[PDB]
Design a protein around this ligand. Structure first.
Ligand SMILES: Nc1nc2c(ncn2[C@@H]2O[C@H](COP(=O)(O)OP(=O)(O)NP(=O)(O)O)[C@@H](O)[C@H]2O)c(=O)[nH]1
Ligand SMILES: [Cl-]
Ligand SMILES: [Cl-]
Ligand SMILES: [Mg+2]
Lengths: 170, 245
């Protein structure tokens, strides 16, 4: 049959949360101005030979909408924490997302995956080693992606599903 | 004098501190009655650099941070007076048939009717939209100058997108955050009930679609509102033109 996974994509504005999601859901890349308030998707995929149903919440990076984080952090079971490799502030924001998720769930064991997006660009301000050290500190996977070329997109979502499943099978 | 000093020092503040930088810049220059000049310079710096409207105000944008600060400090009285009567009507409505806004079929209770909830959501969105575009006489004058300054700067380089830029900014960074979270915005004294919060969030998505001139193409369950969206593009532009010209 089929297990349901509640994924939530979080991160600063314009890091590519929606572009990553739309590659997975609609198999194209759009370069348009369309800031998210909150979008919801569902998709059935096969991960490790098991059919899975993905419930994907694509959240607002614009800080004016920060009041709705508490709700979606309560309902999500795993979090794709996305920064852009050319935006130092978005990298630093990862710590704030992680600490709010840990408070709201009252846990230090929350499934999450660190995603460094826009790796197709030669404009990099966050070194891969810096991101690997942060992920290693948190004990979570780190994946470099490009929503524009689709590099790493499926692996980012599938890795989060596998972290959630590991957590549910404890 | 004061402007080149402020422009040079703004480069030194890391983007993580830009909320505080925007507060201090606006506060400093407003107290010197030089706020228009600050905005003209800050907006022109970014507008002159962009090659397209799609690449303007993206990512870390000090101009955007300044604009959202101006909306918050100069627009609080207007926002509260505009939204409070509307929110009190929807919060105190006794129709339990007209009490659900769930329009995602995958979240819909079997008791409820999708087409009824869609109509319920559209009727609320119409009341809010109509009130907003009827409110120009009440717009705060200093906020009118913020929007005019953005409109004038963008128009020197992107004349065909200058009114959309004002419209998107005003909904994205001012009106819609308050509709989605009216309690945290200080308009209501109590968080609204969850069925109401659901409707407020969905309505704000429709209002933003109108303000941005984009149709729904992402979430499947939002596309049924595209005809309502298209039918309100022109009234939205006329309102933005009134505020920004
Ligand atoms: N070069 C490049 N551009 C990308 C990539 N991903 C997204 N972008 C671009 O970056 C911008 C922001 O993308 P978007 O997906 O809207 O980011 P967001 O995090 O969802 N924004 P928000 O929080 O406001 O909803 C768009 O112009 C998009 O085309 C990527 O991998 N490479
Ligand atoms: Cl040009
Ligand atoms: Cl133009
Ligand atoms: Mg988005």
């Amino acid at each position: 049959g089929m297990t349901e996974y509640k994924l939530v994509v979080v991160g600063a504005g314009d890091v590519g949360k929606s572009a990553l999601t739309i590659q997975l859901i609609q198999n194209h890349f759009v370069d348009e101005y369309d800031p998210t308030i909150e979008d919801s998707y569902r998709k059935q995929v096969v991960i490790d030979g098991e059919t899975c149903l993905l419930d994907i919440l694509d959240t607002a990076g614009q800080e004016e909408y920060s009041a709705m984080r508490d709700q979606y952090m309560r309902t999500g079971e795993g979090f794709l924490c996305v920064f852009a490799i050319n935006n130092t502030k978005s990298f630093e924001d990862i710590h704030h997302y992680r600490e709010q998720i840990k408070r709201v769930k009252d846990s230090e064991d929350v499934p999450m995956v660190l995603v460094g997006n826009k790796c197709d660009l030669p404009s990099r301000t966050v070194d891969t080693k810096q991101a690997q050290d942060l992920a290693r500190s948190y004990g979570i996977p780190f994946i470099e992606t490009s929503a524009k070329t689709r590099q790493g997109v499926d692996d980012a979502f599938y890795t989060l599903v596998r972290e959630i499943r590991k957590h549910k099978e404890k | 004098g004061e402007l080149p000093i402020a422009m040079a020092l703004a480069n030194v503040v890391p983007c993580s501190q830009w909320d505080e930088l925007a507060r201090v810049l606006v506060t400093l220059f407003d107290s010197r009655h030089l706020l228009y000049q600050l905005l003209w310079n800050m907006f022109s710096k970014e507008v002159e650099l962009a090659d397209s409207m799609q690449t303007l105000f993206r990512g870390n944008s000090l101009a955007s941070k300044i604009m959202t600060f101006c909306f918050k400090v100069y627009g609080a009285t207007y926002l509260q007076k505009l939204l409070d009567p509307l929110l009190r009507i929807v919060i105190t409505s006794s129709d339990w048939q007209h009490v659900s806004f769930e329009v995602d079929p995958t979240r819909l209770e079997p008791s409820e009717s999708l087409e009824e909830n869609q109509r319920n959501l559209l009727q609320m969105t119409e009341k809010f939209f109509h009130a907003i575009i009827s409110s120009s006489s009440e717009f705060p004058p200093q906020l009118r100058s913020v929007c005019h300054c953005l409109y004038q700067v963008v128009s020197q380089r992107f004349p065909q997108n200058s009114i959309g830029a004002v419209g998107s900014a005003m909904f994205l960074r001012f009106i819609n955050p308050a509709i989605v979270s009216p309690y945290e915005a200080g308009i209501l004294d109590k968080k609204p009930p969850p069925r109401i919060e659901r409707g407020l969030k969905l309505m704000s998505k429709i209002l933003q679609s109108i303000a941005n001139h984009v149709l729904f193409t992402k979430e499947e369950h939002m596309r049924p509102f595209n005809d309502f969206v298209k039918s309100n593009f022109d009234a939205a532009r006329r309102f933005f033109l009134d505020i920004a010209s």
